[PDB]
Amino acid sequence: SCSMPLGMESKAISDAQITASSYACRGDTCWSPSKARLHLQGRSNAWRPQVNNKEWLQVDFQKTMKVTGVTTQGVKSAATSMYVKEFLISSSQDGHQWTLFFQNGKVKVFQGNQDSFTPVVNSLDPPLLTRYLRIHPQSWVHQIALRMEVLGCE
Numbered sequence: 215s216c217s218m219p220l221g222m223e224s225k226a227i228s229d230a231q232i233t234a235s236s237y238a239c240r241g242d243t244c245w246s247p248s249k250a251r252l253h254l255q256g257r258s259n260a261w262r263p264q265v266n267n268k269e270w271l272q273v274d275f276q277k278t279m280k281v282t283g284v285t286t287q288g289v290k291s292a293a294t295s296m297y298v299k300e301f302l303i304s305s306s307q308d309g310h311q312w313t314l315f316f317q318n319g320k321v322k323v324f325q326g327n328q329d330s331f332t333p334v335v336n337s338l339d340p341p342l343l344t345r346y347l348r349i350h351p352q353s354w355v356h357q358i359a360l361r362m363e364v365l366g367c368e
Contacts, residue, residue: 216282216341220275220364223252227364231274236264245359247271252287252333252363260289260359262296270350271360274309281305282341283365284349288330295330296359298351303338306346315342323352333363341366 221227229248238245245262250271254260263269288297301324303315314321315338324336351358 216280216367217365218367219252219285220279220281220366222250222273222363223254225251227273227275231276232272233274234261234263234271235269236267238262238264250360250362252285252361254361260296260361262357262359265357268350269358270304270348271362272306272309272346272348273364275345275347277368278307278343278345279366279368280341280343281338281347281364281366283335283337284324284347285333285335285363285365286326286349287333287361288327288355289359289361290330291359294356296355296357297327297330298349298354298358298360299326299328300324300351300353301326302350302352303342304348304350305342305344306348307344309346312348326351330359335365
């Protein structure tokens, strides 16, 4: 029913297809957008932006895709849970202009995670046909950290 991971977890989506406003590094490990993949493990296994600055993560499908859902997840840095609790969705055909996902005129706030480990699936109703998807963290616990998956087909 058009509900398959689009490749965040399986790396069917490449690391250049995933970009962000910014990301953080230490030594040789970077909380790059390329690490924002569901259930990813390792040193810096999530996207984390440089603490400052409007923050968002972006996925370029390189093709118009039907997106019916987004799965979000936090991460633990040491024993510190970091996750996005609330977020917005915007869509884009070129990657420069962005249209927010409006609920009846008003941008919809998506209820995100309540912990750092459990994935939470948010269904997009109706689905989106986009080449680009962006997630805009609105509120978070401790800090902004994201692993995610996109659900759809095509």
